[PDB]
């Protein structure tokens, strides 16, 4: 089907998420989930979903020759893993070093190719995800050269060469992904609301085949990630069947601003638990009109948001009422239905939509289920036979907008926009003692005054803080697993325009500090380059299994601008 790519995509996220640990296992989650699995008849698939979005196909000849490329690519990996594996089992046999060398520089030389012939060429749009794919493979290729190249028998000046390589390609792959990703969606901003729904389709679906991956490109930086580590992706992608199924452009000015303008602005993570709905009757035909959400922050502590739309206490239906497990799926029953000669004019509604849950598969219908299925557009990571089990994402939010064109003889438009997040974002903050921990610090529950959540690069897996001045970030509650006494250095993933001390406070009391270094000037775009680690050196344990911990930055002018996209706990042994 159209969807395996978003299938494929989804399945590799989860493994780069939750299986990223030395040795061969990565090279082998490649080959198992993409490499050996995807046939030549899949990859156009890849192609075919983003010349769709674009409403342009590759030229025939240059579109052949990269499916032939991806073949070309899997049959060289399949006998690059075939040596790994042998060599592995019998590391001193000169023979199987030798074979595993050639066959590392033969893929090598190959993904180098194909990584070209997708760059040099008037489609570098409907070749991003097939891109993100050979980039990818590229990534983790360059690592099992720096984890293995000593025992394969490369001298110590190649391996470092292969590193830097490494950590150079991390940057340009980024950088072409983000520069590609950032034309097409500007190519598709328009003025109409059906313009909105391509934009925002595309949006969706690159998010989820090409920006997510790319956001766990740093986890290939073997001697920064020497054990197994944990990413989290916090960026919202959102679904409207109002918007996205009307088979016209709604009548009302700036429609795509209007539906623009449903999407949040950055803020730090909330997971909703409670929703309510009132209907409306607009000319004849009831819909959504309105709704109040209420969520909980990472703390646990409630988040109540102004009410939606037109909501009215007296008659809500009830989804959901501080209920700890989210929906996965919505099941849409748009209408869009207009008079004829004399009332030209649309109604544009969710006349009815039932959500699934997470874990029990229970239903909660406003009105009616219909059969726009979100699995379509946001689905599965696995597939078990139980998308309630399976599902990749979770309903984190709900916003509504609406134009009452009835008013002045134009459309009557009430659309409800689904916010949704990646289940690797849970609702608390958890840290392992084996495990390098990521936490986005976009999972605080509080900001310091003078701390902004700013939109993220794109690159990073959501949105990311900003201070102009010294002062403490944001607050952040984590809850430790295993055992009190186990040591943690902590180190935070930042960006500066200036020299600077960063630190960190463990529950309230400590406070351990380091001074680092500028990453750029002011005005510079964010790249992976931007970005660098501060290891804070003093080793720490928690007091409590439930700690606090704080990120700040100092000493330096305000005017400056430091950004902070995660603070990251590594177990010191």
Same mark, same amino acid.
């Given at each position: ?25 990565? /090279? ?68 199987? !070093? ?6 590392? /520089? ?50 110590? /000046? ?102 623009? =303008? ?14 309510? $709905? ?48 989210? =929906? ?6 748009? $209408? ?136 403490? =970030? ?18 935070? !993933? ?47 344990? =928690? ?31």
């Amino acid at each position: 089907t159209g969807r395996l790519p978003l299938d494929i995509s989804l399945s590799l996220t989860r493994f780069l998420l939750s299986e990223f640990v030395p040795g061969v296992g990565v /090279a082998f989650g490649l080959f198992d989930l993409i490499w050996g699995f995807i046939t030549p008849s899949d990859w156009s698939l890849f192609l075919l979903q983003i010349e769709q979005l674009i409403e342009q196909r590759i030229e025939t000849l240059e579109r052949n020759r990269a499916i032939t490329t991806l073949r070309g690519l899997a049959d060289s990996y399949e006998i690059y893993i075939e040596a790994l594996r042998e060599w592995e089992a019998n590391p001193n046999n000169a023979q199987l !070093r030798e074979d595993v060398r050639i066959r590392f /520089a033969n893929t090598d030389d190959a993904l180098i190719t194909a990584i070209n012939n997708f760059t040099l060429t008037s489609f570098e749009i409907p070749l991003l995800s097939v891109y993100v794919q050979a980039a990818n493979l590229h990534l983790s290729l360059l690592r099992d050269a720096v984890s293995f190249g000593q025992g394969w028998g490369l001298d110590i /000046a190649t391996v470092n060469n292969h590193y830097n390589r490494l950590i150079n390609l991390i940057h340009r792959y980024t950088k072409h992904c983000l520069d590609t990703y950032n034309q097409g969606l500007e190519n598709l901003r328009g003025t109409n609301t059906r313009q909105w729904a391509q934009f925002n389709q595309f949006r969706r679906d690159l998010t989820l085949t090409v920006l997510d991956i790319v956001a766990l490109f740093p986890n290939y930086d073997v001697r920064t990630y020497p054990i197994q580590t944990s990413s989290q992706l916090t960026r919202e992608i959102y679904t409207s069947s109002v918007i996205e199924d009307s088979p016209v452009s709604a009548n009302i000015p700036n429609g795509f601003n209007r539906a623009e =303008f449903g999407v949040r602005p950055p803020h730090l993570m909330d997971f909703m638990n409670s929703l309510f $709905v009132t209907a409306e009757t607009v000319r004849s035909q009831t819909v959504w009109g309105g709704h109040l959400v209420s969520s909980r922050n990472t703390a646990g502590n409630r988040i109540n948001f102004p009410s939606y739309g037109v909501f009215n206490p007296g008659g809500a239906i009830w989804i959901a009422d501080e209920d700890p497990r989210p =929906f996965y799926r919505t099941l849409s029953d748009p $209408v869009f239905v207009r008079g004829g000669f004399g009332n030209p004019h649309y109604v544009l509604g969710l006349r009815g939509v039932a959500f699934q849950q997470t874990g029990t598969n229970h239903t909660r219908t406003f009105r009616n289920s219909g059969t726009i299925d979100s699995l379509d557009e946001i689905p599965p990571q696995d597939n078990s036979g139980a998308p309630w089990n399976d599902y990749s994402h979770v309903l984190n939010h709900v916003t509504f907008v609406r134009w009452p064109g009835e008013i002045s003889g134009s459309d009557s438009w009430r659309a409800p926009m689904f916010s949704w997040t990646h289940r690797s974002a849970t609702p608390t903050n958890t840290i392992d003692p084996e495990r390098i921990t990521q936490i986005p610090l976009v999972k605080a529950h509080t900001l310091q005054s003078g701390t902004t959540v700013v939109r993220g690069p794109g690159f990073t897996g959501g949105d990311i803080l900003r201070r102009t001045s010294g002062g403490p =970030f944001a607050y952040t509650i984590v809850n430790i697993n295993g055992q009190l006494p186990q040591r943690y250095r902590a180190r935070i !993933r930042y960006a500066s325009t200036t020299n600077l001390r960063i630190y960190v406070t463990v529950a309230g009391e400590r406070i351990f500090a380091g001074q680092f270094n500028k990453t750029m000037d002011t005005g510079d775009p964010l790249t992976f380059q931007s970005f660098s680690y501060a290891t804070i050196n003093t080793a720490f344990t =928690f007091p409590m299994s439930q700690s606090s911990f704080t990120v700040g930055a100092d000493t330096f002018s305000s005017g400056n601008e430091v950004y902070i996209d995660r603070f990251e706990l590594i177990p010191v042994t």
